[PDB]
Design a protein around this nucleic acid. Structure first.
Ligand SMILES: [Zn+2]
Lengths: 208, 100, 83, 94
RNA sequence: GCCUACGGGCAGGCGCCGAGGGUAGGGCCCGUGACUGGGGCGAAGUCGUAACAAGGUAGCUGUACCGGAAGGUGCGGCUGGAU
RNA sequence: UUGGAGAGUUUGAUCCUGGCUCAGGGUGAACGCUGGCGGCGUGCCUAAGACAUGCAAGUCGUGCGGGCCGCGGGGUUUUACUCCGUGGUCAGCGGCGGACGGGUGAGUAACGCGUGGGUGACCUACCCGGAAGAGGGGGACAACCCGGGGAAACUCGGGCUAAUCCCCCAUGUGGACCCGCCCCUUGGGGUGUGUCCAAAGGGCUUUGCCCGCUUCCGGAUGGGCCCGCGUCCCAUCAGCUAGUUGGUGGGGUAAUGGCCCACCAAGGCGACGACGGGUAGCCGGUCUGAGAGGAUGGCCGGCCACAGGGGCACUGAGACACGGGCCCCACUCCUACGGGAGGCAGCAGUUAGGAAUCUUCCGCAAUGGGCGCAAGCCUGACGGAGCGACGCCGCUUGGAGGAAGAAGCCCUUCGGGGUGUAAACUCCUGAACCCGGGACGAAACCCCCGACGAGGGGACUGACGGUACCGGGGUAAUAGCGCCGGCCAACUCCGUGCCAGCAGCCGCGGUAAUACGGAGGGCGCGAGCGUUACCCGGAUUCACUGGGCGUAAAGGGCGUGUAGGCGGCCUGGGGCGUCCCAUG
């Protein structure tokens, strides 16, 4: 059970916009537009001061839910990130942003993160030449993450790239829309990320 | 390298054999201070030369009696009861502290 | 009679050997004497077999009948090529 | 309820008897040569020691005498002899 | 007795040690247990009021004897005794 | 310097002391609710209980002789009887392997294991290398044939016969032992006389090559014994010891040794914990921990220990020998009641016990081992499959669009809030599933050429498995458990009424329960989630890091001094501790 249930509800739990559905979470409706209160029968109620724990918590989740990844991997990552020489936080987002499924999203070969998954599990994705269905896969720098010849004439993908002529790609990424390709340049830097989170809290959380 | 220990004759009641008191020193495996421990080896004197209160070098030898696998090397410092005395008084003390 | 053989080290369906020298009587995967090369049955890496003929020669010299299959790998390594 | 790797026991017996007769043989001969030297039969004593030494070394050839085993017996015999031949010197043969 | 080139070997016999057993006595550990001490618990009855304020004979205490009971008393010690 | 989070709880209230509790991580797990997939790993932790059945060690006819069944060919004019060759089959004699590998932890607190060393106290099958040799003579026992005992298992006796089985004799490169000397230095090495010791043959491509054989020096690997240091709890276990400690001699071994015997001496050990008792295979590592430390030691590897209980030896390079032997004991089974037959702690399985631990599967393809010149035989070592969410890891139950928002369910200050973009519905992708193709792992030994060297060429050979994996086609296609008073993320209504019940701890419940029971809602985690049990952790609450003792629990009623610990200034030697370098 890798989640998959009511979504732009979490956009609502956190109180920060969670780009979980893409188009639409741009139309007046990631719900945060016009209904910022959290879910539940008590959403509209005055909220008490959140224990240190609470914030440390809620902020872990914010990270997590964005990438939509079962705690088990998420925590695993964070573990693998503690073992690397670096800033225990920045490196976290490192692998976090290096997952095949994410890449595709940033490459624009998909409306949303979720969508990207399917694209991967269904195998519409080339990676340095061969297809790949395992999203959790880690895209090394200098890999041609692309689309299967087979998938190119797709009503979805097509309509997506059409949009790309008009949006810059992440600074650590390249792509040749014309040929529907794209390369992973180098691990993105914290300064390069946009995310409305505070790693520090996340780290701080994993020491309880 | 056949081992070599330096110690003292404390016993001289036996035949061609002498009991040698060998003191060793070392930091306590956990508390750190130098602990001083010891052991008695049953040395071996062919010509009955070695006498009580003599310090001697022990060397690992071919098994001889049950619990007598050392020959004496050379006499280090002769005449020094001082040390024996200690061993002795300690032994005597043993007589005390019981349920008889 | 010390032999020269292989040692299972891969895993379920992933055999990865280990050319070594040991007394006949020991186990396959048991305490060897001098590891002298490994060979990869499936050949996934361009480097699926190494040897160090220098030591190989020692053994045989001193007397160490090698396994049939084992030998074959030493021959490939040029363990016995006298030119 | 059978197993042909038992033939070995069927065989061991054969060697038990085999070894046995040889070993004892020696003992007897040795014990013979001995009491001769007690009396001072310089001639014959050796005549026997020799039959002894042979028998010993003969078993050593096989699996009857451990190896150095023959040796000890060769030492413990000759020595026990020479010495006795002091109670009345002059070895006849050699 | 069996075999032998008579040198000697096997069979057998006896013997020591010896697993184990018998008899006597002792020690030590487990199970079951009549009879039996007290203990702790818990809401709460009964008789009394020892302690906590000088608790109403200051208290505490080693010891000793006595007593439904708590405790009382002697002797000594202590303040962790109010005025 | 890549490394350390605390909270609840004694009060009217405070602070301190202090204990109890929780959150964290982990498990060869078990139980409950739920349960789709694959990969890799792992699965009696309890009765070392008892065990049916099958399989788990054999292999050589290029070591020797034959029996059964049968075929071909010879000597016979023919017949009976025979001579050679041969196929199957059986077992024997003889060689090698059974002392490896497989299991298990009972025992054991011990040189058992860990570590580092010793061996002038040692052996070592087959392998490798180097030197030397194989001359002559004879014998026994199975098989087989004849007979006897027994219910049976099996056994007794008589006779034949081969061999690489056995014996004798000669040669002696050499080697052994005694004695003497030279060197070394505990039984190391050189040497001299004396004495003693060798051996088998078989196959072809048969005048030479292969296998094997004998003596000796060396190698390699493997191992015996020995020593230093290390190695759990109880002192409500304090003294233990008579082969016991030592000596001489002798036995015994590969070998040192009280290991064993005789005699002699009177010793040896113990608070630096003897002896007694309790418990436990040890380690690499593993778990936790900031670390120091604590816990563990199954899977894998190394070492030890047993192979129903206890004793013992044989054969052997090696055993005191799990599927070898002899005895006694308990137990099971056959029994003509005289007497026998048995040992899964091998693989699978049976039953028992228990909370709980799998298929009487496939293969000998690969790796390894044995035996073989080889073809090849054996290999429940192994390599695979299978069963168990028992662990970990990957993966799915869909993606996008979609109302100021359906219905139902919940709440309400009745106006509305909520579940909720959730659904419906729209489009798109497409696990399952279908068809086709289809694997590495495997290249040797062998054969051929070449000198059976090097080198080169040829052939066979897969359990997994038609599986992985590629190609095409292809359906929108499982979700559950815990929790929501504080610690601790998550709040309303009703039912209830110190009842029923909850509960880790503080507690909650006597009609207004955020603490019971349901529901709406919410948090947490997801093919899983809880629970119990156990480890480390929090706990600096055994304190080396890193505690204390006026009243909190803690100074011995005082003294005396024994062992022991600890110790003043200057100079020098030694350098054991201690520090530095190199090296194994
Ligand atoms: Zn949204």
């Amino acid at each position: 059970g890798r989640y998959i249930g009511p979504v732009c509800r979490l956009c609502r739990r956190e109180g920060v916009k969670l780009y979980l559905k893409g188009e639409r979470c741009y139309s007046p409706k990631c719900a945060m537009e016009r209904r910022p209160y959290p879910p539940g029968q008590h959403g509209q109620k005055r909220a008490r001061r959140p224990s240190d724990y609470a914030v440390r918590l809620r902020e872990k989740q914010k990270l997590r839910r964005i990438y939509g990844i079962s705690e088990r991997q998420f925590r695993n990552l964070f573990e693998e990130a503690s073992k690397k020489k670096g800033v225990t936080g920045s490196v976290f987002l490192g692998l976090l942003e290096s997952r095949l499924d994410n890449v595709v999203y940033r490459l624009g070969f998909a409306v949303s993160r979720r969508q990207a998954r399917q694209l991967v599990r269904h195998g519409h994705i080339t990676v340095n030449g061969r297809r790949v269905d395992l999203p959790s896969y880690r895209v090394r720098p200098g890999d041609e993450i692309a689309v299967a010849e087979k998938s190119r004439n797709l009503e979805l993908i097509r309509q997506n790239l059409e949009a790309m002529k008009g949006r810059k790609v992440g600074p650590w990424l390249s792509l040749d829309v014309e040929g529907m390709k794209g390369k992973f340049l180098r691990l993105p830097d914290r300064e390069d990320l946009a995310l409305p989170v505070n790693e520090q809290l996340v780290i701080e959380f994993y020491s309880r | 390298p056949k081992k070599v220990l330096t110690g003292v004759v404390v016993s001289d009641k036996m035949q061609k054999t002498v009991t040698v008191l060998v003191e060793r020193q070392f930091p306590h495996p956990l508390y750190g201070k130098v602990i001083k421990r010891s052991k008695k080896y049953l040395a071996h004197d062919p010509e009955e030369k070695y006498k009580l209160g003599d310090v001697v070098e022990i060397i690992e030898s071919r098994p001889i009696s049950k619990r007598k696998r050392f020959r004496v090397l050379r006499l280090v410092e002769s005449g020094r009861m001082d040390l024996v005395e200690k061993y002795l008084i300690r032994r005597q003390n043993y007589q005390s502290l019981s349920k008889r | 009679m010390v032999k020269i053989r292989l040692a299972r080290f891969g895993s379920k369906h992933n055999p990865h050997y280990r050319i070594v020298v040991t007394d006949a009587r020991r186990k396959r995967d048991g305490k060897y004497i001098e590891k002298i090369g490994y060979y990869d049955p499936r050949k996934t890496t361009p480097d699926w077999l190494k040897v160090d003929v220098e030591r190989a020669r020692y053994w045989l010299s001193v007397g160490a009948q090698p396994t049939d299959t084992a030998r074959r790998l030493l021959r490939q390594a040029g363990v016995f090529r006298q030119e | 309820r059978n197993l042909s790797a038992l033939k070995r026991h069927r065989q061991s017996l054969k060697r038990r008897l085999r070894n046995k007769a040889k070993k004892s043989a020696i003992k007897t001969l040795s014990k013979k040569a001995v009491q001769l030297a007690q009396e001072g039969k310089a001639e014959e004593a050796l005549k026997i020691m020799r039959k002894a030494e042979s028998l010993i070394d003969k078993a050593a050839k096989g699996s009857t005498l451990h190896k150095n085993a023959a040796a000890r017996r060769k030492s413990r015999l000759m020595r026990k002899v020479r010495q006795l031949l002091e109670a009345a010197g002059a070895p006849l043969i050699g």
